[PDB]
């Protein structure tokens, strides 16, 4: 399992986020995106819908 945002692995012991669509990212990674957009970087499903 690789974070698609930073391209670094999702290691045990990191602050990670699973979106409703079931896609994993480092929190710090995706939070920057979810700032400017409410959509999953991978599948584009809106995280509120």
């Amino acid at each position: 399992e690789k974070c698609t945002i930073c391209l670094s692995m999702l290691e045990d012991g990191e602050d990670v986020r699973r979106l409703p669509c079931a896609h994993l990212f480092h929190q710090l990674c995706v939070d920057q995106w979810l700032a400017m957009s409410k959509k999953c970087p991978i599948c584009r499903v809106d995280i509120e819908t």
Binding site: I5, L7, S8, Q32, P41, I42
Partner: protein, 147 residues
């Protein structure tokens, strides 16, 4: 940040380079790349090398790279200047997307234009109303500019 991500992308391009395209730093400034796109096949661009500039913004991958052709091209979605009307480079940018995926989708654009949302209306009318004129001109432009 941007730089790490750009380096990872570049390292991944070296490990597993795509055919049909090439990309990397113009010099040592990692935020300015060039890429080539081979004109997609089953399409009027075949045989042409198309040169692009890629400018990665400081907060990439959260903002899309500025990607422009420097090879002149006949396409409904590329003007002279080589600006590209492709969704993923504006509203449909995602930080999950890489420069190689961008490059693919630009090749994808070259195969299947979006004349309905055209950067160059002239060429869109022709793409739809008269395809073989479109191909003829694109092929001609290819041979003049991309070969």
């Amino acid at each position: 940040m941007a730089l790490k991500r750009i380096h990872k992308e570049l390292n991944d391009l070296a490990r597993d380079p795509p055919a049909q395209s090439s990309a990397g730093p113009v010099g040592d400034d990692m935020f300015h790349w060039q890429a080539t796109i081979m004109g997609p096949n089953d399409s009027p661009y075949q045989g042409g090398v198309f040169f692009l500039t890629i400018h990665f913004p400081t907060d990439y991958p959260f903002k899309p790279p500025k990607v422009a052709f420097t090879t002149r091209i006949y396409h409904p979605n590329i003007n002279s200047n080589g600006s590209i009307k492709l969704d993923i480079l504006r509203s449909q940018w995602s930080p999950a997307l890489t420069i190689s995926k961008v490059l693919l989708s630009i090749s994808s654009l070259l195969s299947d234009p979006n004349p309905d949302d055209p950067l160059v209306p002239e060429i869109a009318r022709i793409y739809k109303t008269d395809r073989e004129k479109y191909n003829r001109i694109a092929r001609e432009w290819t041979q003049k500019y991309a070969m």
